[PDB]
């Protein structure tokens, strides 16, 4: 068995959607990310109010690719005033640190049966950027990602 995730109460988990494969590669290389304004605001609030008591995990997926590509942990608050134009599109304002945990492709077929009660019971694989995942569903997703091969 594997009960690593039992009794974990502090932890928050979000979907990250990237239109760009390039941005994924740059995030893996330099351990940084940036979301939309409302996306950054959601993550910064969860990171700050967690106050080191647990992790904020990020489940990355390239829109249209049909698979999740990895897991990272958020490792800083959002700096909203940073160099512009470092990503594929000039849409994103700011930067925060991440630490990538898993880089592996996990087909949506492995995850589509987990549904998010906070998003109209939709499959977790039909989420938008910074969709938050309830902790109990997030544990199921993480166990799947870690044990896929
Ligand atoms: C640099 N961050 C990003 N890159 C590409 N796409 C994104 C991003 N955030 C949200 N979406 C949809
Ligand atoms: Cl999106
Ligand atoms: Cl939204
Ligand atoms: Cl929850």
Curated annotation (Swiss-Prot):
Induction (UniProt): Following heat shock stress.
Positions with a binding annotation for RNA: 17-19, 23, 33-34, 63, 87, 92
Domain YTH: 11-145
Region Interaction with m6A-containing mRNAs, annotated ranges: 9-149
Result of altering residue 92 to A: Reduced binding to N6-methyladenosine (m6A)-containing RNAs
Similarity annotation: Belongs to the YTHDF family. YTHDF2 subfamily.
Domain notes: The disordered regions have the ability to interact with each other and to 'phase separate' into liquid droplets within the cytosol following binding to mRNAs containing multiple m6A-modified residues. This leads to the partition of m6A-containing mRNAs into membraneless compartments, where mRNAs may be stored, degraded or used to transport mRNAs to dendritic arbors in neurons.
Protein name: YTH domain-containing family protein 2
Gene (UniProt): YTHDF2
Entire protein: shown range: 408 to 548 of 579
